Design a protein around this ligand. Structure first.
Ligand SMILES: [Zn+2]
Ligand SMILES: [Zn+2]
Length: 173
């Protein structure tokens, strides 16, 4: 591809060595703070057991938090969501000008918040994978609560939440 696997825009893109996906440094999960000089494998391709390489990311410079194992598994789940063609409406928060969204939705959630909370520096960083899964489910519950049932965004949410459940059972059997 010539466009970022996450945001579908061009520019300065990093290619994975093992799959066709390319990424902006800030769109990969975790975000990268430099362009790698040699081998580089994306979070979806990286091995859980034998990490080919550590990433130049914020959590690597920072060091009750995710174990290294759970960190990789949760980054895989979140990057899988961000790369899915149905996920784009969930990358950013709904405008407060849309139908009193923030009256209806008392606990808003989107993928940019989930990305941020995977970073240990965040005051509200995840300490368990259950918290990550809870935020993803909250996000899709909010989508179903707010959006018109017949709308394209509601249908996308219904499909993507079920794709996620499938990935979850692969990654946390
Ligand atoms: Zn991007
Ligand atoms: Zn890859």
């Amino acid at each position: 591809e010539d466009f970022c696997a996450v945001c579908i825009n061009g520019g300065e893109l990093l290619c994975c060595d093992r799959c066709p996906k390319v990424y902006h440094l800030s769109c990969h999960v975790p975000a990268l703070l430099s362009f790698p000089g040699g081998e580089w494998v994306c979070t979806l391709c990286r091995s859980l057991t034998q990490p080919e390489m550590e990433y130049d990311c914020e959590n690597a410079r920072y060091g009750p938090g995710l174990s290294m194992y759970d960190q990789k598994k949760c980054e895989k789940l979140v990057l899988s969501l961000c790369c899915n063609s149905l996920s784009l409406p969930f990358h950013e928060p709904v405008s407060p000008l849309a139908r009193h969204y923030y009256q209806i939705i008392k606990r808003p959630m989107d993928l940019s918040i989930i990305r941020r909370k995977l970073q240990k520096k965040d005051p509200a960083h995840y300490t368990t994978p259950e918290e990550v899964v809870s935020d993803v489910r909250l996000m899709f519950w909010n989508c179903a609560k707010f959006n018109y049932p017949d709308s394209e965004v509601a249908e996308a949410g219904r499909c993507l939440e079920v794709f996620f459940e499938g990935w979850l059972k692969e990654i946390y059997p």
